[PDB]
């Protein structure tokens, strides 16, 4: 079996040119797709902004149209999902995680148009969901579609072009090449057995889709936060404590996200109308709140910079947090099309900032700046609910660009995964596949 | 399927023993690495001090430069030949093997031999890195506490071996992420599933980085400052640079391997023709670390200087050739010490040179040679050792120009792509393949 290894070693890192070239086309498409999707969601949130100006007098009438637009679009989104592709509701990352294990179908002819226009609906109405959901899945199907359309054969070409689509999907959603790649090879890939995912192909995919994203989204970062201060070595223990706090809260969040999936199922019982209606009702509540308290609504990217700069009061923070846990659950849990990845960054920021506030007053000898705790805490909910620290860290890092905060970021992150383990929480992406895969067996 | 649901619900669960044991491994590897770092420093400084004492008489100084380097080199090659041949050269492939259960981790031997062996080769100013020594030293440390604590299981044997190897790279570059990424991209059993707990590898690296920071805070290994940016119409240039690294990547692998052989003849396996040729190159090192220090040493010194575009074109080409020669002669000659470091320094110098050409050719792009320096810096590591994702994140963590992420990836990828289509192989694997096949044949 050593002789086998010698033969393998000498044959390492060889990816059929077909695969490579096909990853390239994959990335390019996912990029354009995500670009288009992003522009779509923007256009719609702008339309809705335009109607609130046409009715800018009459207060209740404005509160009406805010609700009704959000209603109408959310419904339209929930519909498309229920009526044409149930798999494309909720996130869509576990759906892809499954596909990689060969345990789920990649019904692209369905999902692509449903998840796309479906999300365009839910995100475009200002619901509390990210774009990673839609684009990761959309990304995977694009990878499937071009595997089909080109009839490429083999386990490699089916795992690889599915994974590179998935990555280009995260990369194009955050402008975060490395985060895309790291996500695949830390969370996405078949977690329990060896697989034939060519990493070099994953790359080319992501490269393309980042280039695509940069062509149309040049010269504006999603989160601008500026160069923050440093953290002295005697400051480190404080990030570990923050990590612990995230570590206990991590699974508690997972309970509610799952539990809420259930408690909302009853409200509609699986009924296409009780759903779409409940769908547009949460949706309406979103457009409403995206006016009377916009920090409680929307994707969350907008208040990240604001909180990091320490511009919110303590009151205002605790409010934003509570209001955002509620609205985050209500949208994701209710099986609307859209990731929980983005609003998890937003919650981790707000929570980390709050810790930093308290940290600042209690330790003036440290010369603290709340905003370093905001950035540490930013990817830490992602590290105790999704349990992909390495992805969270390198995502935050790629986005906030405070590499000097590498230690506090790791230490917070690690402390979060450690306490999220010792309090018996479960990789929220896994647990959703386990519920979905089990729900398929236990109805036989 | 049923099995998978059982697995999913049981994912990311690491026996607390393993975690706690990782923490201690990192801590030791950190301290070890620190101490090793200080050692090499100390000895380069001794030699600096003797050249002060004989600073008059020109050929007398050129001699003492030679003879200290000679004597230390010898002491290194000896300790290696006489007590642990496994700990000559890099020691990364040696650990890669151990991960595959195909090599032994004779720590009782390697620890003292690689340590003091390296202290000899590095401390005499040889063209070798610290990653070699620290990575291996790191794995054995992980082995040793697996032994000393009698931890049982495949997990505990692969995990504590890996976290040690990571902590080892991390503390060698102050690069936590590069440590972990290296494990799960290059070090791990490349062809079968394994039981390396990533959460455990983290904790290791955390500890060893904290260890490194405690003694080496407020000094970056490479300072380069915030470089300029790269416009989109400039990207193609990094792809061309990547292709150039892609062709030369394997060509370098040839000579590094070929030279391991052409130098074996000179000694035939004989502990005396070895140790003597050992201190002969070693002497030529300290000698050159005086009459042209850029051609000698670890190479970190000239990175900043090249990135700022302070070398002329002549001076660069020279430094390149000189450094290819000296790099081979030191690593190829099976002296204890990585080729990782000198590969960065080669990549910078090559990249810079490309950037110079680039600048004069395209004034409308407003280029700055130093952006090609930083692209190229991890590009040789992407075409010779073929671990681009570790290369990028390593350079990124060390040069901190996140804005150059695209050029860095594009160059890197273009290098792994052309080092595949010209039939080169992961230089760390090819060394294991040589070593495992020379075992059975």
């Amino acid at each position, epitope marked *: 079996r050593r002789r086998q290894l010698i033969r393998q070693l000498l044959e390492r890192d060889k990816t059929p040119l077909a695969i490579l070239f096909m990853a390239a086309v994959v990335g390019t498409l996912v990029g354009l797709a995500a670009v288009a999707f992003d522009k779509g969601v923007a256009w719609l949130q702008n339309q809705r902004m335009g109607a609130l100006v046409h009715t800018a007098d009459n207060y209740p009438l404005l509160l009406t149209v805010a609700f009704l637009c959000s209603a109408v679009l959310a419904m339209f989104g929930y519909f498309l999902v229920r009526k044409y592709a149930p798999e494309a509701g909720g996130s869509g990352i576990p759906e892809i995680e499954g596909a990689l294990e060969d345990q789920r179908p990649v019904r692209w002819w369905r999902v692509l148009p449903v998840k796309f226009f479906g999300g365009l609906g839910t995100l475009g109405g200002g619901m509390v969901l990210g774009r990673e959901g839609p684009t990761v899945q959309i990304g995977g199907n694009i990878g499937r579609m071009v595997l089909d359309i080109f009839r490429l054969k083999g386990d490699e070409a089916r795992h690889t072009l599915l994974a590179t689509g998935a990555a280009a999907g995260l990369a194009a959603a955050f402008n975060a090449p490395l985060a895309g790649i790291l996500f695949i090879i830390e969370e996405m890939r078949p977690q329990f057995r060896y697989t034939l995912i060519s990493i070099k192909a994953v790359f080319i995919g992501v490269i393309m889709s980042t280039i695509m994203y940069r062509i149309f989204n*040049h*010269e504006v970062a999603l989160i601008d936060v500026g160069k923050l201060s440093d953290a002295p070595l005697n400051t480190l223990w404080l990030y570990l404590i923050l990590g612990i706090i995230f570590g206990i809260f991590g699974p508690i969040f997972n309970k509610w996200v799952l539990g809420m999936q259930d408690l909302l199922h009853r409200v509609h019982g699986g009924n296409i109308t009780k759903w779409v209606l409940m769908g547009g009702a949460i949706g309406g509540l979103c457009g409403l709140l995206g006016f009377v308290a916009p920090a409680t609504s929307g994707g969350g990217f907008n208040l990240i910079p604001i909180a990091t700069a320490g511009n919110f009061s303590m009151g205002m923070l605790v409010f934003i947090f509570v209001a955002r846990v509620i609205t985050t659950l209500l949208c994701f849990s209710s099986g609307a099309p859209g990731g929980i990845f983005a609003p998890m960054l937003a919650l981790g920021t707000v929570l980390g900032t709050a810790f930093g506030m308290v940290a600042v007053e209690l330790f003036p000898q440290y010369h603290l700046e709340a905003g370093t705790f905001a950035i540490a805490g930013m990817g830490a909910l992602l590290a105790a609910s999704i349990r992909a620290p390495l992805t969270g860290i390198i995502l935050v890092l790629e986005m906030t660009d405070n590499y000097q905060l590498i230690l506090p970021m790791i230490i917070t992150g690690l402390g979060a995964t450690l306490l999220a383990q010792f309090t018996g929480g479960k990789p929220l992406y896994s647990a959703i596949l386990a519920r979905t895969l089990a729900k398929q067996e236990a109805e036989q | 399927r049923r099995q998978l649901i059982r697995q999913l619900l049981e994912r990311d669960k690491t026996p607390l023993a393993i975690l706690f044991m990782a923490a201690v491994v990192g801590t030791l590897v950190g301290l070890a690495a620190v101490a090793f770092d200080k050692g090499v420093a100390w000895l380069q400084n001794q030699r600096m001090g003797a050249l002060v004492h004989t600073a008059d008489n020109y050929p007398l100084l050129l001699t003492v430069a030679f003879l200290c380097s000679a004597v230390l080199a010898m002491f290194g090659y000896f300790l290696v030949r006489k007590y642990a041949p496994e700990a000559g050269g890099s020691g990364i492939p040696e650990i890669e093997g151990a991960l595959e259960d195909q090599r032994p981790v004779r720590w009782w031997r390697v620890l003292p031999v690689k340590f003091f062996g390296g202290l000899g080769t590095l401390g005499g100013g040889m063209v070798l890195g610290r990653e070699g020594p620290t990575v291996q030293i790191g794995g054995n440390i992980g082995r040793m506490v697996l032994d000393i604590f009698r931890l049982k299981g495949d997990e505990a044997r692969h995990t504590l071996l890996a976290t040690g190897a990571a902590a080892g790279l991390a503390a060698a570059f102050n690069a936590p992420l590069a440590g972990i990424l290296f494990i799960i991209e290059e070090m791990r059993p490349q062809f079968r599933y394994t039981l390396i707990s990533i959460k455990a590898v983290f904790i290791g690296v955390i500890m060893s980085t904290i260890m490194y920071r405690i003694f080496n805070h407020e000094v970056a290994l490479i300072d380069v400052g915030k470089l*300029s940016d790269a*416009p*989109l*119409n*400039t990207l193609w240039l990094y792809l061309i640079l990547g292709i150039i690294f892609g062709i030369f990547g394997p060509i370098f692998n040839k000579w590094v391997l070929g030279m391991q052989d052409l130098l074996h003849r000179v000694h035939g396996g004989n502990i005396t023709k070895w140790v003597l040729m050992g201190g002969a190159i070693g002497g030529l090192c300290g000698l050159l670390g005086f009459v042209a220090p850029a051609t000698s040493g670890g190479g970190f010194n000239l990175i900043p200087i090249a990135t700022a*575009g302070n070398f002329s074109m002549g001076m660069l080409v020279f430094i390149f050739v000189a450094r290819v020669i000296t790099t081979l002669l030191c690593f190829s000659s099976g002296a204890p010490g990585g080729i990782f470091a000198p590969m960065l320094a080669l990549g910078t110098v090559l990249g810079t040179a490309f950037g110079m050409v680039a*600048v004069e050719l395209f*004034p*409308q*792009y*407003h280029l*700055e040679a130093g952006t090609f320096a930083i692209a190229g810096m991890g590009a040789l590591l992407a075409a010779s050792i073929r671990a681009p994702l570790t290369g990028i994140i390593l350079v990124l963590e060390m040069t901190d120009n996140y804005q150059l992420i695209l050029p860095m990836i594009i160059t890197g990828l273009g290098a792994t792509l052309l080092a595949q289509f010209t039939g080169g192989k992961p230089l760390y694997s090819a060394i294991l393949a040589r070593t495992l096949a020379k075992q059975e044949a």
Partner: antibody
Framework: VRLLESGGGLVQPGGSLKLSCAAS????????MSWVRQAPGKGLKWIGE????????NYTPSLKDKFIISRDNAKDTLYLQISKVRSEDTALYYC??????????????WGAGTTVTVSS | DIVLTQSPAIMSAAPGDKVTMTCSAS?????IHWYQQKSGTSPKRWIY???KLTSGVPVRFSGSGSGTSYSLTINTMEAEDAATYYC?????????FGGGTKLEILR
């Protein structure tokens, strides 16, 4: 953001003057700067550009040190020095901050200009 | 160094009119920029990279072209558009400016 150039006015033919452009509202290093002049009634003429690290300075098809461009990142100030001033050099002089989109460079923000009159 | 020549040197339309001026260039140039210089004001970067609008430029303004001819168009020109407009390229060094097209208003 503002560029407020000065030191212009009256010079004797053949003689020489130094324009300062003083900038404030943006990290002045980070930015390639430039000078563009405009003769009364006529169009625009690029003079030169200096990067932040002063390690690249291109001028237009000029002469010897017909023009000399420099910058003091400490003072946030751009300088243009003209020699042997024949009357072609009677213009409004703009210091402009340089930038790009896809990567083809433009003149981002222009100062107000000082006037230089070559006359006896 | 590319010589850029601008269509009408002086043009004249009445508000409401769709208006076009032109930057024809001696060699091939790509991604040109346009500057608006109103009376006794400094140039203002107007349209950049052939067709992108600077922030705050009314959407009544547009850009197109490629190769040797480029244009700038105002769909329903407005009286506050009286300026001279220069085009400028920097696809080839050194960069170079147009002759200017002075738009004058009919009222």
């Amino acid at each position: 953001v503002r560029l407020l150039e000065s030191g212009g006015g009256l010079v004797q033919p053949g003689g020489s003057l130094k324009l300062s452009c003083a900038a404030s509202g943006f990290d002045y290093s980070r930015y390639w700067m430039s000078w563009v002049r405009q003769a009364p009634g006529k169009g625009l003429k690029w003079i030169g550009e200096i990067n932040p690290v002063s390690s690249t300075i291109n001028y237009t098809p000029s002469l010897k040190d017909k023009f000399i461009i420099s910058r003091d990142n400490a003072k946030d100030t751009l300088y243009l020095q003209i020699s042997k001033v024949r009357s072609e050099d009677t213009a409004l002089y703009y210091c402009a901050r340089l930038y790009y989109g896809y990567g083809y460079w433009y003149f981002d923000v222009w100062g107000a200009g000082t006037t230089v009159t070559v006359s006896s | 160094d590319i010589v850029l020549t601008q269509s009408p040197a002086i043009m004249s339309a009445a508000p409401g009119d769709k208006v076009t001026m032109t930057c024809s260039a001696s060699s091939s140039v790509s991604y040109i920029h346009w500057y608006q210089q109103k009376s006794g004001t400094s140039p203002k970067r107007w349209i950049y990279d052939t067709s992108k609008l600077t922030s705050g430029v009314p959407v009544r303004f547009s850009g197109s072209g490629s190769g040797t001819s480029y244009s700038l168009t105002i769909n329903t020109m407005e009286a506050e558009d009286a300026a001279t407009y220069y085009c400028q390229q920097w696809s080839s060094h050194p960069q170079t400016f147009g002759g200017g097209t002075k738009l004058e208003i009919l009222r």
